[PDB]
Amino acid sequence: MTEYKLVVVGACGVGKSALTIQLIQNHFVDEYDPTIEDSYRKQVVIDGETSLLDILDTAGQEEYSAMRDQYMRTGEGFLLVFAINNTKSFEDIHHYREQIKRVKDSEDVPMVLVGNKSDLPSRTVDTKQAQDLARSYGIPFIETSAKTRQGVDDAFYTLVREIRKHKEK
Numbered sequence: 001m002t003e004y005k006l007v008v009v010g011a012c013g014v015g016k017s018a019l020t021i022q023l024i025q026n027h028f029v030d031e032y033d034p035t036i037e038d039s040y041r042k043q044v045v046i047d048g049e050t051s052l053l054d055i056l057d058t059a060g061q062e063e064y065s066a067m068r069d070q071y072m073r074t075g076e077g078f079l080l081v082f083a084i085n086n087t088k089s090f091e092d093i094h095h096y097r098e099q100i101k102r103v104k105d106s107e108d109v110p111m112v113l114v115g116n117k118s119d120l121p122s123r124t125v126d127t128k129q130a131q132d133l134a135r136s137y138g139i140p141f142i143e144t145s146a147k148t149r150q151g152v153d154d155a156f157y158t159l160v161r162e163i164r165k166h167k168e169k
């Protein structure tokens with residue numbers, strides 16, 4: 001069976017855990033310990049192909065050991081998550097893209113920009129800004145809400161389609 005290694009990255013509090021649990025369980029978690037970093041597996045059918053998605057939900061203290069670089073290097077695709085009500089989380093996206101570029105030693109790594117918490121009215125990052133950033137990186141932009149499940153399957157399934165496009169090159 002085909003297997004895809006996906007990694008969910010972004011600032012603390014953006015909804016990485018909430019998005020992962022929404023994809024895995026179809027339930028919204030109000031509280032998920034921000035120190036818990038773990039991987040989950042879900043069997044899905046995407047465009048007729050059965051596959052196992054192994055999703056690493058990053059968390060815990062920010063550190064950069066060589067062991068952590070090697071663990072991130074195993075990721076085939078990354079969701080760059082920011083929250084639409086947190087400008088600092090959007091400003092931090094460049095850091096996450098640079099760290100992916102550094103450990104993968106590549107300019108062409110499958111990624112999707114995800115603007116989470118789209119259910120909140122307290123927007124501080126406009127959709128146009130996020131679309132321009134994703135255009136500058138050559139990647140898709142998807143608006144999500146882990147609370148209502150808006151865009152959740154689209155974010156993960158779009159990342160799987162980007163990994164498929166990369167494996168074809």
Ligand SMILES: *[C@@H](Cc1nccs1)C(=O)N1CCN(c2nc(OC[C@@]34CCCN3C[C@H](F)C4)nc3c(F)c(-c4cc(O)cc5ccc(F)c(C#C)c45)ncc23)CC1
Nearest residue numbers: 009012034035059060061062064065068069072095099100
């Ligand atoms: C919060 C978890 C909490 N623990 C306790 C209380 S809350 C959470 O979800 N986190 C914490 C932050 N993590 C993390 N943070 C960053 O950068 C954060 C910023 C903001 C403070 C200063 N620092 C630099 C920038 F200004 C942004 N970067 C992380 C990071 F890059 C990696 C990591 C590590 C290595 O070795 C390689 C690597 C390669 C690709 C990657 F995508 C990432 C990632 C992510 C890599 N790990 C954690 C980082 C995690 C989330």
Ligand SMILES: Nc1nc2c(ncn2[C@@H]2O[C@H](COP(=O)(O)OP(=O)(O)O)[C@@H](O)[C@H]2O)c(=O)[nH]1
Nearest residue numbers: 012013014015016017018029030117145146147
């Ligand atoms: N309204 C709303 N709250 C969310 C959403 N996603 C996450 N949250 C909340 O934001 C907080 C941080 O979410 P969490 O998944 O722990 O973020 P992480 O640190 O990136 O793993 C929690 O209180 C979640 O319930 C979302 O899309 N909408």
Ligand SMILES: [Mg+2]
Nearest residue numbers: 016017034059
């Ligand atoms: Mg978390």
